[PDB]
Design a protein around this ligand. Structure first.
Ligand SMILES: Nc1nc2c(ncn2[C@@H]2O[C@H](COP(=O)(O)OP(=O)(O)O)[C@@H](O)[C@H]2O)c(=O)[nH]1
Ligand SMILES: [Mg+2]
Lengths: 440, 90
């Protein structure tokens, strides 16, 4: 039982791709989620014959049990690989997941695109207007640079090499248009149901020599999807960056005082540090830090911590404000910020003056699109025109934003979690933004 | 069948004295076509405060999570805020 590093993975794909069975299989055989329910169905399966059972059958029963609302475990799913503890999201098709994908905690280190290999299922999955492409575009825009492609349902096409090759060609085109470099992407033929190439190599494809990907140090090869996941590159965590901790809630506890709560996005928080809260600019000492049941010596990137501070009323700091270190690039409110905005598909056009609500870290504030400064080629960033008169679906543009209320944001290059945002309107996320400059 | 998602919501109280049983009873009393309430637990977050962590399964086309969060938040006497702890496709 070796010590593991932590990574986040998001699984995307069309409704017929079989991505839930595929993700479910990995969690079942490499993790420990809803195991008492799994055990109940493994025993029940004896009824099908004389004892043997398929993992897919158990997953089907687990799904129905979850639908009834009687399973016990929460929706935070994890599984292990030789090197990692993986937190995985089988992306929901729910439209409210888009905002959650942009501002939620745990942004992905790698996206796994599941592709149905069948004849009419593959084409349906790569439609330009499909939810799958939107998810891929969002991941790319948010900096998810690693991608793994799994071509599922290979049994349905009799593990035909030509079909796999054509699918790889067409999928490479699909992802290249989004922005990914296919040479850095492993393409794994699998059967989520039968288990081929999931954890163990398939015996149904003698032509299969394995997957490969180019990395900065050389070429990495493997056979299975689990190997591809274990091959994900170790991303650098922001432990040494200045502290940034967006507030989620603020409590007034008898006998303790003010206790803000939030996720440490960058840097580390420790008792004894002197912190500043922005947009207000209030400064104070951190008295103690707690998480779950433990008192901490430090809260590191990813920890959702409570901390007690003196001489700050709950009325002067609130959700959306950002806590940072007063002696290491303290956070500041801004007069405005310029960001690259990617307009998603929606029933409207954007003109200067537009003032929708933006969700950035824990802040929820209406911000004016004060000026449309440029229109750009999305993938390269090249300026196409100065001062476009309007933006339509698909456009990438540099926009100057003016917040309607005091707001603390950061450039994405410096503090990623405080530099990406979702634009809300018409009951959906209509645009995603990446902050490029801030006027503090 | 209709597309669904399983969601875990964190419902936060005002302080360490908030009546948590009332808070969850109010959440569970919310009825929406396509919404199924699941398991819940009260989880310590530090300093004696506990948040409600509750599962629900929703039909994507019928249940707005934005609306559900807003509805839960109407119980101002018990609820300070709600957040999505995690969500998955089913
Ligand atoms: N042929 C085949 N069907 C699969 C496989 N994995 C899942 N399915 C099927 O695809 C459909 C479900 O996809 P999802 O619900 O998204 O998981 C059902 O008909 C499943 O039985 C696989 O590896 N091969
Ligand atoms: Mg399905």
């Amino acid at each position: 039982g070796k010590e593991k590093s932590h990574i986040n993975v998001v699984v995307i794909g069309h409704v017929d791709s079989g991505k839930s069975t595929t993700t479910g299989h990995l969690i079942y055989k490499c993790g420990g989620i809803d195991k008492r329910t799994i055990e109940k169905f493994e025993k029940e399966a004896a009824e099908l014959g004389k004892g043997s059972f398929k993992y897919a059958w158990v997953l089907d029963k687990l799904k129905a049990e979850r639908e009834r609302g009687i399973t016990i475990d929460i929706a935070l799913w994890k599984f292990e690989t030789p090197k990692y503890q993986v937190t995985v999201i089988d992306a929901p098709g729910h439209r409210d997941f888009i905002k959650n994908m942009i501002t939620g905690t745990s942004q992905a280190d790698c996206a796994i695109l599941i592709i149905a290999g069948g004849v009419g299922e593959f084409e349906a999955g790569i439609s330009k207007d499909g939810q799958t492409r939107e998810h891929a575009l969002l991941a790319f825009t948010l900096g998810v640079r690693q991608l793994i492609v799994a071509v599922n349902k290979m049994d349905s096409v009799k593990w035909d090499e030509s079909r796999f090759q054509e699918i790889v060609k067409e999928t490479s085109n699909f992802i290249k248009k989004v922005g990914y470099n296919p040479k850095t992407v492993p393409f794994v033929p699998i059967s989520g149901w039968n288990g081929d190439n999931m954890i163990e190599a398939t015996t149904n494809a003698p032509w299969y020599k394995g997957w490969e990907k180019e990395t900065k140090a050389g070429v990495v090869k493997g056979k299975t999807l689990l190997e591809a996941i274990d091959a994900i590159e170790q991303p650098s965590r922001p432990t040494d960056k200045p502290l940034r901790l967006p507030l989620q809630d603020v409590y007034k506890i008898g006998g303790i005082g003010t206790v803000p709560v939030g996720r440490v996005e960058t840097g580390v928080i420790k008792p004894g540090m002197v912190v500043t809260f922005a947009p207000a600019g209030v400064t104070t000492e951190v008295k103690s830090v707690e998480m779950h049941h433990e008192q901490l010596e430090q809260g590191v990137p990813g920890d959702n911590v409570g901390f007690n501070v003196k001489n700050v009323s709950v009325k002067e700091i609130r959700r959306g404000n950002v806590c940072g270190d007063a002696k290491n690039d303290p956070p500041k409110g801004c007069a405005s910020f310029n960001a690259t905005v990617i307009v998603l598909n929606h029933p409207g056009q954007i003109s200067a003056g537009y003032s929708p609500v933006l969700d950035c870290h824990t802040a929820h504030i209406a911000c004016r699109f004060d000026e449309l400064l440029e229109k750009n080629d999305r993938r390269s960033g090249k300026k196409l025109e100065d001062h476009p008169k309007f933006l339509k679906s698909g456009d990438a543009a540099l926009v100057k934003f003016v917040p309607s209320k005091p707001m603390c944001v950061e450039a994405f290059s410096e503090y990623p979690p405080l530099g990406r945002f979702a634009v809300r309107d018409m009951r959906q996320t209509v645009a995603v933004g990446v902050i490029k400059s801030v006027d503090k | 069948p209709a597309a669904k998602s399983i969601v875990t919501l964190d419902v936060k109280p005002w302080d360490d004295e908030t009546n948590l049983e009332e808070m969850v009873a109010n959440v569970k009393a919310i009825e929406m076509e396509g919404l199924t309430w699941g398991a819940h637990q009260f989880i310590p977050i530090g300093f004696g405060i506990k948040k409600l962590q509750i599962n629900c399964v929703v039909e994507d086309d019928k249940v707005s999570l934005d609306d559900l969060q807003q509805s839960i938040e109407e119980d101002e006497d018990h609820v300070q805020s709600t957040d999505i702890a995690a969500m998955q496709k089913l």
